[PDB]
Amino acid sequence: DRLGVLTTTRRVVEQAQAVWIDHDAVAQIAEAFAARQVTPPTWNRELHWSDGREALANYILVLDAVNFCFWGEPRWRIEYAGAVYDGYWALAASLKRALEQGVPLTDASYLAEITRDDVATIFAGEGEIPLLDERARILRETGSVLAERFAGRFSDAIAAAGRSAVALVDIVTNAFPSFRDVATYRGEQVRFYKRAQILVSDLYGAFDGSDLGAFDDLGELTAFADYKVPQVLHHLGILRYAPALHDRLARREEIPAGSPEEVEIRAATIWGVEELRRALASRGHALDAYQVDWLLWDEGQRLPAGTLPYHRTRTIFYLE
């Protein structure tokens, strides 16, 4: 456990007061998923952009740099190629739309200099992308670190990982402050690394496990502690919420980032996915944790209305 995500989240799950895993539900979900041999959707090529290996690598870095927090009213929606998109697909469609119109979002020089007005246009639609100014600051940070550290080529960073998914997460969090996804719980550091781990899996997806997306240790990635996978784990009965937390999610009351309740949901999401992976594997359906994550996240896209709302956390980068 070379990143310490499973080890530190395990401490949270064992002590957790608002969140617990129903291991009976895990076994019952495993039985059903293993029977119909469910796999995750193929990495989505319609709404993800593509080009040369150097450009595609920078595109993945940019995509996942700003891959967070799409909720709010009025709902942020985007028009691309005849269809309207919200949430993640709005992020993906907005970047692809921009690049196709010749916006150089793969050029470190441009990224380093990008204005509030530039990213407001890239993400222009109904409402406004949450934390707009924050995404401008991250794209500047991302651009200038690419330029200074890696000759404006994320391929250099990937090359230095030596086809270790875990080594690449560590290289990203070391170099890019905004990818440092840790918290504390009862005075102990909890490590999560949602966006850095997503990034590694998105390279694997984009490059078909070849060239820059080649990794010999993808099994070492955990789930990505977001707000849809826990909502899917709650819907499937795997995650249970205590009264006060349940009522907060139902009332759509925002939950402060790094608060005990938020850290417990995220830690229980990691261990919810890992317990489902173990149970599935025991029933002869061996998947990697990131594959179980993708599968569950896909389920998140078509939950039956009346399902308990996802937790609302404003992703904070107070330590720029």
Ligand X SMILES: Nc1nc2c(c(CN[C@H]3C=C[C@H](O)[C@@H]3O)cn2[C@@H]2O[C@H](CO)[C@@H](O)[C@H]2O)c(=O)[nH]1
- Give the active site residues: 226
CA distance to 228, 237, 242, 271, per residue, from 21 (Å): 16, 9, 11, 8
> Which residues pair with residue 85 across a beta bridge?
78
Report whether 263 contacts 182 (CB < 8 A): no
Under the binding rule (CB under 6 A), the answer on residue 226 touching ligand X is yes
Under the binding rule (CB under 6 A), the answer on residue 317 touching ligand X is no
Burial of 246 (0-12, 13-18, 19+ CB in 10 A): middle
Distance CA(107)–CA(61), nearest Å, equals 12
Distance CA(201)–CA(222), nearest Å, equals 10
Segment interacting with ligand X (CB under 6 A) among 16-24, 143-151, 154-162, 226-234: 226-234
Cα 229 to chain centroid, rounded: 10
Segment interacting with ligand X (CB under 6 A) among 41-49, 98-106, 159-167, 236-244: 41-49
Half-sphere exposure (CA, 13 Å, Cβ side) for 33?
A: 28
Under the binding rule (CB under 6 A), the answer on residue 68 touching ligand X is yes
Q: Minimum Å distance from CB 241 to ligand X?
A: 18
Under the binding rule (CB under 6 A), the answer on residue 41 touching ligand X is yes
Q: Which of 204, 207, 224, 271 binds ligand X (CB under 6 A)?
A: 224
Q: Which of 125, 205, 213, 260 binds ligand X (CB under 6 A)?
A: 205
Burial of 42 (0-12, 13-18, 19+ CB in 10 A): exposed
Under the binding rule (CB under 6 A), the answer on residue 294 touching ligand X is yes
Enumerate the known binding-site residues for queuosine 5'-phosphate: 67, 88, 194, 224, 226, 293, 297, 301
Nearer to ligand X, 264 or 293 (CB): 293
- Which residues here bind ligand X, judged by CB under 6 A? 40-41, 43-44, 67-68, 70, 87-88, 198, 202, 205, 223-224, 226-229, 293-294, 297
